[PDB]
Structure 1
Amino acid sequence: HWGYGKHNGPEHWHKDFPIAKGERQSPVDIDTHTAKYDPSLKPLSVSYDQATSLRILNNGHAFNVEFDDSQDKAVLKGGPLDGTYRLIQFHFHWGSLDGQGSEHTVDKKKYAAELHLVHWNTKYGDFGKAVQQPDGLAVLGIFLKVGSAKPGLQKVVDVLDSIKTKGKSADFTNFDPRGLLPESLDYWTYPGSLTTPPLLECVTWIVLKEPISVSSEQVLKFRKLNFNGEGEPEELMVDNWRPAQPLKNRQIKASF
């Protein structure tokens, strides 16, 4: 019954998921002075103009904006990646207050939230097969800081009222994820894992350097969500982030 609380939070996950203390766990702190520019990186390609969103879902840990991944359309390629990776969902991690909420950190700085756009390697045919492979997934990570509103986010913010509790979903078509990207695609990359159970070490992390700004009101609405199910005592969905994990035998590379 894993979660983020005292008796079920990240310090407990290793019991049911021993890979929590593995060799390539995420997230990590990005030490900007130890990251090295890698000229072997090729241009990053984020091709989301044919993306088809379908639904949004409160899964009791975050909320997922789900996409139609039955065909080739919204894909991530280039950069550190070999081949083609298809967009399946995005979600966020956020805090109780603006000084925390991100998973990755930058020189130990915690941002207010972190967006994860999740893609799977089409050479493995389905998501399920891809998460049995050391290069099965690519997650594009984008930090959120609080200041001006992100217009492209507001459609998400306004449907959250309709999925307050665990297991609730709503139709969510025609959402364009290009509206959540910053201007620059400068990034850091490293091999890692899912940041929640089952913590599978199947992910190429691509973390953009440029945060997007969202408004206080927008993130305040994220914090109105619930971890609990309908009719249960209210546990606000906040601080659904895993702290930074040991880097071990890894190097973080810069695209810039």
Structure 2
Amino acid sequence: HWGYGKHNGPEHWHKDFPIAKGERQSPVDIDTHTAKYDPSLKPLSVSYDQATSLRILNNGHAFNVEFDDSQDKAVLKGGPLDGTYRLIQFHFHWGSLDGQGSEHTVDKKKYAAELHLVHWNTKYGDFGKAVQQPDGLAVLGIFLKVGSAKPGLQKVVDVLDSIKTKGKSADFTNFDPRGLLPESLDYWTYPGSLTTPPLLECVTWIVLKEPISVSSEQVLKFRKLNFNGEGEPEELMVDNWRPAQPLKNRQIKASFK
């Protein structure tokens, strides 16, 4: 089964998921000098006030904070998007060291981690149908650098001990994802894919320019999670990031001058 190891990592995924070599794969390097400002791009509308988190899950590749997506409670609109995209979950990708961990890179710079807030286009009814459509998902990507702690992340950090191993979940209600955003909503946007198998080419990527700061202690706690299940030899959940893929026939657009 696929993962991030020597023998099942990103360079192997194409054998089971041939779209791994497709025309709109993610992540990509964001060449900031080649991205074109698009004055027609609109401000992102992030409406998370009524978000309903439910549960946090170690799935053996990351941890997901899941939300009730049965109503328009936490929605992303505007920007490059047409219509309404409902938040279903967020998760992160991180490194074994502070110098790597992000999936997208910025002028080849790797951040310590990257947060993905995953939304599906409500015109397709459910996430499973949305992933079959070129405009099915909108993923909001937020870079993490190591410095001052992010107070809004701490509630996530402190539950990780209870979901150390693959398959473990914990009740995780009343989490406000607004506490994970940076001050600015300036962004780059491009058409891409899921960055994990099945790598479906269904994502409008919206990657925020301003990283959030998290503390070394916060990210160290990410690195104490396990890829393995309970009762298996410990494999630290680190370096669960896919590297940058060829941009091919795509333009990255910037919301800001």
**Is the TM value for this pair above 0.5?**
yes
1: distance between equivalents of 2:6 and 2:167?
23
* TM-superposition CA deviations, 1:92-147 (whole Å, max 9, x none): 00000000000000000000000000000000000011011000000000000000
Whether contact under 8 Å (2:137, 2:202) holds in the other structure is yes
Whether contact under 8 Å (2:56, 2:63) holds in the other structure is yes
- Kindly report the root-mean-square deviation, in angstroms, between the aligned alpha carbons of the 2 structures: 0.3
SS at match of 1:170: strand
Q: Tell me the equivalent position of 1:235.
A: 235
2: distance between equivalents of 1:36 and 1:128?
32
What's the CA shift for 1:203? 0.1
2: distance between equivalents of 1:17 and 1:137?
19
* TM-superposition CA deviations, 1:16-50 (whole Å, max 9, x none): 00000000000000000000000111121000010
SS at match of 2:91: strand
Q: Tell me the equivalent position of 1:174.
A: 174
2: distance between equivalents of 1:184 and 1:43?
10
Q: Tell me the equivalent position of 2:64.
A: 64
Gaps in structure 1 of 5+ consecutive residues: none
SS at match of 1:246: coil
Q: Tell me the equivalent position of 2:99.
A: 99
2: distance between equivalents of 1:209 and 1:153?
19
Whether contact under 8 Å (2:29, 2:108) holds in the other structure is yes
What's the CA shift for 1:66? 0.1
4+ residue segments displaced more than 6 Å:
none
Pairs aligned (count)? 256
Q: Tell me the equivalent position of 2:53.
A: 53
2: distance between equivalents of 1:147 and 1:127?
35
* TM-superposition CA deviations, 1:184-231 (whole Å, max 9, x none): 000000000000000000000000000000000000000000000001
Q: Tell me the equivalent position of 1:148.
A: 148
Gaps in structure 2 of 5+ consecutive residues: none
Q: Tell me the equivalent position of 2:23.
A: 23
What's the CA shift for 1:73? 1.1
SS at match of 1:149: coil
Please give the TM-score of this superposition, normalised by the length of structure 1.
1.00
2: distance between equivalents of 1:161 and 1:49?
28
Whether contact under 8 Å (2:43, 2:185) holds in the other structure is no
What's the CA shift for 1:232? 0.1
* TM-superposition CA deviations, 1:138-182 (whole Å, max 9, x none): 000000000000000000000000000000000000000000000
Please give the TM-score of this superposition, normalised by the length of structure 2.
0.99
* TM-superposition CA deviations, 1:47-78 (whole Å, max 9, x none): 00100000000000000000000001100000
